[PDB]
């Protein structure tokens, strides 16, 4: 009874492949010859943040483009001011293995997670004068890899037990779950209208999930290795993934197939963090050879290189107005390129 | 207005930096360890005698140590093992012994030893369950490995008296099978410290302390370009 079901699954995958080859009229690299190239990108390190001890694993910008969180591997979550390099907050954490952090769109709460399988949400109102543990969410059986805020009441998390989950912060229970992956979900990216979200896993697959319904819509399989990072396009119709096979890939939601592949012959290192600019013309990608690359998203050319880190780049973040790019690596240094 | 706000932010930054310097004085003096092994190897007896992760605090000669054994995680190890690159040593527990467990332990040890981000860390190898090997050698090690027949006891090692020669022969055979792939791509960057331990024993903590002493002394000799 297993041969006929897998045979029908192979026939459905062949029908999907035939539909994608039928919808593939022309590639993106053919009609972008009229668009002028950007050229050499010259950015400099304006600010440098040095207050961490162990390796910085993640960061997230605020909506005002002023404050930013940063999580380290010593049990520290420091909220920095990016303008004057003043440490605004420094939360000591329970477990020192942190893999993700997020900032609320209102600026009131900060979540974090890691190998303890528990998402800790802290409050920044400080009625007494200090921060404290506002909420602890414990419903996963694997390591928490990413977490993002929809609002002050709901939070989308992804864990290492092939499960994503939408949580309600007030009741302390899961609103809904997402069980469709076969590999460890590494990162997720929300929509600009917070209606859908993409999630890439370790089986070379990125799935598009609906928030309110709770079921997978589309599945994208174009990579060869583990997809480590993902980032939604600023308009809301495309996204980009980075994997360990030294290839970035720009996927579309409408055509249900890959549009472009960003690679090179000399790059043989994995990709840890990808992010778009405010206009979506540039695509920044953090690699494992101690520097980041700024690709042109419409010409597939390496327009610039950000080489100022001494260790492996772990996180990259672009502001909402597109004014600066904060890159954090494993040498406990946050560098603000502009 | 803005000047008093900047003064308050500078005072808050000075208090936060003082707290970070105190936490740096606490954090730089402690040595982290990664306890790793299979479920049937005997790491539960190790964490009893000596959530997704469990924390074990102890101290030797007024020197602090934290041991982080893996808890409720899955079988896939290729992503969360990269977070353990700042530890001082990996205490790798194997069971000296129906599936082939020794070959899986050798494959896991080879994948740790040849990892890109695990070239700086040293491995303290603990071959547990020696009395079980002493029982099972009397009445399947030679079947899983045909090199056990063409093998003699190394004369450079000093065994303890009152032991059967086949038991210490199997011990030295498994130790040489680990050191065959240990001494293939080391090149002086990191070493392996094999030890013969039992399930109920209290001398393992001194072995871990002496091996961490050896790791840190070799690191300080290597930073001065001497060794």
């Amino acid at each position: 009874e297993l041969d006929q079901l897998r045979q029908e699954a192979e026939q459905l995958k062949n029908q999907i492949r035939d539909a994608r080859k039928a919808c593939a009229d022309a590639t993106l690299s053919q009609i972008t010859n009229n668009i002028d190239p950007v050229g050499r990108i010259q950015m400099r390190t304006r600010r440098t943040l040095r207050g961490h001890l162990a390796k910085i694993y993640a960061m997230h910008w605020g909506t005002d483009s002023r404050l930013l969180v940063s999580a380290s591997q010593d049990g520290k979550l420091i909220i920095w001011d990016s303008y004057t390099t003043n440490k605004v907050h420094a939360i000591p954490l329970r477990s020192s293995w942190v893999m993700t952090c997020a900032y609320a769109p209102s600026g009131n709460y900060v979540a974090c997670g890691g190998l303890d399988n528990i998402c800790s949400i802290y409050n920044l109102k400080t009625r007494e004068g200090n921060v404290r543990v506002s909420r602890e969410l414990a419903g996963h059986t694997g390591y928490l890899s990413c977490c993002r805020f929809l609002d002050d009441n709901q939070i989308v998390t992804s864990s290492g037990d092939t499960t994503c989950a939408l949580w309600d912060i007030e009741t302390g229970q899961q609103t809904t779950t997402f069980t469709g992956h076969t590999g460890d979900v590494m990162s997720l990216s929300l929509a600009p209208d917070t209606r859908l979200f993409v999630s890439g896993a370790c089986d070379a697959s990125a799935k598009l999930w609906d928030v309110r319904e709770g079921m997978c819509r589309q599945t994208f399989t174009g990579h060869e290795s583990d997809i480590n990072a993902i980032c939604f396009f600023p308009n809301g119709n495309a996204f980009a993934t980075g994997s360990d096979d030294a290839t970035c890939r720009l996927f579309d939601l409408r055509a249900d197939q890959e549009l472009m592949t960003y690679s090179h012959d000399n790059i043989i290192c994995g990709i840890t963090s990808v992010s778009f600019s405010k206009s979506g013309r540039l695509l920044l990608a953090g690699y494992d050879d101690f520097n980041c690359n700024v690709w042109d998203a419409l010409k597939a050319d390496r327009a610039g290189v950000l080489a100022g880190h001494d260790n492996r780049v772990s996180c990259l973040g672009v502001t909402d107005d597109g004014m600066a790019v904060a890159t954090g690596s494993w040498d406990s240094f946050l560098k603000i390129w502009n | 207005d803005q000047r008093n706000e900047e003064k308050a932010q500078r005072e808050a930054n000075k208090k936060i930096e003082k707290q970070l310097q105190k936490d740096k004085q606490v954090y730089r003096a402690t040595h982290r360890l990664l306890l790793l092994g299979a479920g049937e190897s005997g790491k539960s007896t190790i964490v009893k005698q000596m959530t997704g992760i469990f924390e074990t605090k102890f101290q030797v000669d007024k020197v602090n140590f934290h041991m982080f054994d893996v808890g409720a995680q899955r079988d896939e190890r290729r992503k969360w093992i990269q977070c353990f690159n700042d530890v001082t040593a990996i205490i790798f527990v194997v069971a000296s012994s129906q599936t082939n467990r020794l070959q899986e332990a050798l494959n896991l040890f080879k994948s740790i030893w040849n990892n890109r981000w695990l070239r700086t860390i040293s491995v303290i190898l603990f071959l547990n369950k020696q009395d079980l090997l002493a029982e099972k050698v009397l009445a399947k090690i030679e079947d899983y490995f045909p090199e056990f027949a063409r093998y003699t006891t190394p004369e450079d090692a000093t065994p303890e008296p009152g032991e059967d020669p086949r038991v210490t022969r199997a011990k030295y055979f498994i130790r040489d099978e680990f050191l065959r792939i240990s001494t293939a791509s080391g090149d002086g960057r990191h070493y392996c410290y094999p030890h013969f331990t039992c399930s109920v024993d209290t001398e393992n903590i001194r072995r871990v302390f002496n091996d961490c002493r050896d790791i840190i002394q070799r690191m300080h000799l290597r930073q001065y370009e001497l060794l």
Partner: nanobody
Amino acid sequence: QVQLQESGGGLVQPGGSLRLSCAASGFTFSNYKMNWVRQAPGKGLEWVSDISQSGASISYTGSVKGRFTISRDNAKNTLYLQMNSLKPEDTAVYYCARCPAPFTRDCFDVTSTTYAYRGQGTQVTV
């Protein structure tokens, strides 16, 4: 899309030979170290053998050493396993597995329960 397909098998006699094939689709074949891993009925998965990227480093299990031969053809994009002088204890489901990272020597999750970078396997009954 990464997909591996096995070929060969059937009912064989002890002391005979059998050639198992593995065809790849969706990736570059000459960059990944390749594995053969069996699973016996009633037991868990156990690693049999591996061949490197360029085909230089070839390693086996001790129980299968001297009776199995693992080879690869990067030009024809295939992985072969020659099984001469068989044993009745070798009745198992065989899988050809791919290590997840390119240009590396370490392979972590090859002999695991839920791994997505290998095929469906083939039954070899002696």
